[PDB]
Design brief:
Helix content of chain B: 55-70%
Number of domains of chain A: 1
Keywords (chain A): Calcium, Calcium channel, Calcium transport, Ion channel, Ion transport, Membrane, Phosphoprotein, Transmembrane, Transmembrane helix, Transport, Voltage-gated channel
Number of helices of chain B: 1
Largest sheet of chain A: 5 strands, antiparallel
Strand content of chain A: 5-15%
Largest sheet of chain B: none
Family (chain A): Belongs to the PMP-22/EMP/MP20 family. CACNG subfamily.
Shape of chain A: elongated
Distance between the termini of chain B: 55 Å
Strand order of the largest sheet of chain A: 4-3-2-1-5
GO molecular function (chain A): channel regulator activity; ionotropic glutamate receptor binding; PDZ domain binding; voltage-gated calcium channel activity
Organism (chain A): Rattus norvegicus
Number of strands of chain A: 5
Radius of gyration of chain A: 20 Å
Shape of chain B: rod-shaped
Membrane topology (chain A): Multi-pass membrane protein
Radius of gyration of chain B: 17 Å
Strand content of chain B: under 5%
CATH topology of chain A: Butyryl-CoA Dehydrogenase, subunit A, domain 3
Oligomer: part of a larger assembly
Order of helices and strands of chain B: H
Order of helices and strands of chain A: HEEEEHHHEH
CATH architecture of chain A: Up-down Bundle
CATH class of chain A: Mainly Alpha
Largest interface: A-B, 20 and 15 residues
Number of helices of chain A: 5
Helix content of chain A: 55-70%
């Protein structure tokens, strides 16, 4: 299953990265009652909240974040949203290692480095979700943008496990 | 009428989602640090 594992890792990395940039770029993270200028149903993202019913259909402005040191640190991280963006870079760095993996067969650390990048990126997503949820709370529903980030975490962990498996079996074959 | 799946009421649905995410993350990391090391294996 050596061929399918590499194809799974290469396909999975592209799926995890593409879902991440769409989740960050799009603004359907949360459905809430608010104003995009009375208040109406709105769909909120990481940077913009926009109403989806009423006379202001589709028109919207940037989300303000700053309206208590612990609250300031949570708001600063949430306003910057570095963790979801950090997960985008780690997928990008992890994808490059997998692409460069099929070039340098002699160096077996490049594929393991990709595995660490995918595993580390998933930890940046769950910490990004907790920061986003905690700041949101401090009725609603989650759109497909939030679930894209949730599904980008599961795929990143699965590809990381497969990437580590590929490296481990290579050292097992070298030891044999 | 106690609705079905009411035993999950004490913890909000946000916690239940993040517990599954935390469980998957811990399992992968524990496997990563215990299997990737030549000295350990």
């Amino acid at each position: 299953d050596r061929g399918i594992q590499m194809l799974i890792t290469t396909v999975g990395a592209f799926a995890a990265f593409s879902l991440m940039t769409i989740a960050v770029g799009t603004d359907y993270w949360l459905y809430s009652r608010g104003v995009c200028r009375e208040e109406v149903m709105t769909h909120s993202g990481l940077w913009r909240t926009c109403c989806l019913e009423g006379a202001f259909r589709g028109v919207c402005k940037k989300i303000d974040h700053f309206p208590d040191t612990a609250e300031y640190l949570l708001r600063a991280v949430r306003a910057s949203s570095v963790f979801p963006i950090l997960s985008v870079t780690l997928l990008f760095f992890g994808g490059l290692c997998v692409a460069a993996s099929e070039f340098h067969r002699s160096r077996h650390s490049v594929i393991l480095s990709a595995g660490i990048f995918f595993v580390s990126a998933g930890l940046s997503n769950i910490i990004g979700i907790i920061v986003y949820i905690s700041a949101n709370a401090g009725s609603y529903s989650y759109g497909w943008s939030f679930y894209f980030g949730a599904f980008s975490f599961i795929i990143a962990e699965i590809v990381g496990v497969v990437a580590v498996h590929i490296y481990i079996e290579k050292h097992q074959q070298l030891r044999a | 009428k106690p609705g079905v799946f009411s035993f999950l009421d004490p913890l909000a649905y946000e916690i239940w989602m993040c517990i599954v995410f935390a469980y998957i993350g811990v399992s992968v990391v524990l496997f990563l640090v215990s299997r990737f090391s030549p000295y350990e294996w």
